[PDB]
Amino acid sequence: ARYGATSTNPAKSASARGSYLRVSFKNTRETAQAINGWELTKAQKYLEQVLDHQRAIPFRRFNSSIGRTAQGKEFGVTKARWPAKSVKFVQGLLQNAAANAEAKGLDATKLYVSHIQVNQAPKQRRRTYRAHGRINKYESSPSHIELVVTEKEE
């Protein structure tokens, strides 16, 4: 429990989280922001299309010197990617949230991603060897991912 700041009704919402997931934090942040606020089924279809390279995840903050693609145009950006590992983790948490909403008795057809946040887990440390007998860090940037889907209402 104790997710990030939310403003939705806990009785109309369902939560899902994953901690210390060995997936890139920056890629997963971009993936989460790509579906923040989307309807659940639309977001899942979009993630499947991202995995199929039919649509892309726009990279807005962590995008320096990444590359350009025509698939960022629908988001009004030139820089977009297809972070498959992040997408897979996100859709796993999305299906977990959908299962929790079904167990809570929420209407799956009104579910939208009312909250999704990715922050940095503790780094997993490895070593890389460099010229002239030097050693540098080779750490991972794992993620804590949390999301809550809420029934759309008025």
Contact yes or no for 27/85 (Cβ under 8 A)? yes
126 part of the interface to Mg ion, by CB under 5 A: no
Query: Cβ closer to Mg ion: 85 or 110?
Result: 85
137 part of the interface to Mg ion, by CB under 5 A: no
8 part of the interface to RNA, by CB under 7 A: no
67 part of the interface to RNA, by CB under 7 A: yes
Structural tokens at position 12: 């109309």
Residues that contact RNA, how many (by CB under 7 A):
77
Give which of Mg ion, RNA, none residue 17 binds (C-beta under 5 to 8 Å, depending on kind): RNA
Query: Cβ closer to Mg ion: 105 or 133?
Result: 133
Query: Cβ closer to RNA: 39 or 62?
Result: 62
Residue (of 89, 71, 72) closest to 28 by Cα position = 89
Q: Where are the beta strands (DSSP E) in the chain?
A: 13-21, 57-58, 80-81, 111-120, 127-130, 134-137, 143-151
Piece of 38-46, 88-96, 105-113 that binds RNA (CB under 7 A): 88-96
63 part of the interface to RNA, by CB under 7 A: yes
33 part of the interface to RNA, by CB under 7 A: yes
Q: For residue 136, what are the β-bridge partners?
A: 128
